[PDB]
Design an enzyme around this catalytic site. Structure first.
Site: not given
Ligand SMILES: Cc1cn([C@H]2C[C@H](O)[C@@H](COP(=O)(O)OP(=O)(O)O)O2)c(=O)[nH]c1=O
Ligand SMILES: C[C@H](O)COCC(COC[C@H](C)O)(COC[C@H](C)O)COC[C@@H](C)O
Ligand SMILES: Cc1cn([C@H]2C[C@H](O)[C@@H](COP(=O)(O)OP(=O)(O)O)O2)c(=O)[nH]c1=O
Ligand SMILES: Cc1c[nH]c(=O)[nH]c1=O
Lengths: 137, 137
Positions: B51
């Site tokens: 992303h």
């Molecule tokens: C970064 C972040 C993610 N989340 C949640 C949203 C997503 O469901 C999950 C995974 O986040 P994501 O940012 O999608 O993970 P990565 O970039 O590490 O693959 O965590 C939060 O609740 N708070 C946060 O600050």
């Protein structure tokens, strides 16, 4: 009674991609994050800390490994081992701390309510007791 | 070249008691810290990420072990290994990222300029490239 101390539980977002704990200033902890710091690569027989603060609020979080936090106020001492990254140790003003038994490669993250100010530290245990006895007795 | 990315060098306060790195919002990094989160216990063949963000500014720091960050904008891709807790990878808007090769015990900390907002994320790679082509070309 260990006044001015709490254990705060954070979300732990886990699935097959790993674990993720978020902490939002004023939401997951009671204060705004002005500063973070982290302590790494501490040798096994080191104690560090040996201080209090007058105005700072802080949260300690062991993100890998384990570390023991010794907390004192006048007439009480409690030892808390931190070993879960979803758990934070809130410490208010006028609590004395020392930290020891850092494992290999232990990571200890601190979230702080204020920028670094040496003048807000009490590094003299005698001054500490002197200011603390007024507060806690 | 790879716009909207920087490596930022923090203080490393290193002595016989161990190492300490402080980061003060707006001083050591260009934005206020509204949110921190951290990723741990990630299995060796996992890839996290996929992303971008529209408005968020963030800094990535590996506090233990090592992790690789694959950064992409149209026509440009760079892999950065993070393995030094005193080094931050600033990522601004409209850079695509993926994280992989998390080692055993790896801890990846992120400092964020805004509270979590699922609507700021771009998770659809085709909408990412369309929005990024508009900016970088
Ligand atoms: C970064 C972040 C993610 N989340 C949640 C949203 C997503 O469901 C999950 C995974 O986040 P994501 O940012 O999608 O993970 P990565 O970039 O590490 O693959 O965590 C939060 O609740 N708070 C946060 O600050
Ligand atoms: C190597 C030695 O065993 C460590 O001694 C620690 C110290 C403080 O403990 C205070 C509290 C009761 O725990 C002992 O002092 C006695 C008094 C305060 O004068 C002072 O040390 C500060 C250094 C280690 O930075
Ligand atoms: C916590 C912190 C310390 N420092 C300096 C002050 C000290 O000389 C050194 C170690 O700090 P100190 O607070 O003495 O560490 P500990 O609680 O782990 O014993 O780093 C900063 O410059 N900025 C900071 O935010
Ligand atoms: C090239 C590429 C295609 N699709 C993705 O999801 N990510 C990539 O990095």
């Amino acid at each position: 009674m260990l006044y001015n101390v709490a254990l705060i539980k954070f979300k732990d977002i886990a699935d097959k991609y790993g674990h993720l704990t978020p902490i939002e200033g004023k939401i997951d902890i009671p204060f705004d994050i002005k500063r973070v710091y982290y302590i790494t690569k501490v040798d096994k027989d080191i104690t560090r800390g040996y201080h209090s603060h007058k105005k700072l609020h802080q949260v300690l979080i062991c993100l890998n490994g384990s570390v023991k936090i010794r907390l004192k106020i006048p007439d009480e001492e409690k030892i808390i081992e931190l070993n879960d990254p979803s758990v934070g140790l809130y410490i208010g003003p006028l609590v004395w701390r020392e930290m020891f038994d850092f494992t290999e490669g232990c990571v200890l993250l601190v979230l702080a309510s204020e920028y670094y100010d040496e003048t807000d530290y009490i590094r003299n245990y005698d001054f500490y007791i002197d200011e603390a006895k007024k507060r806690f007795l």
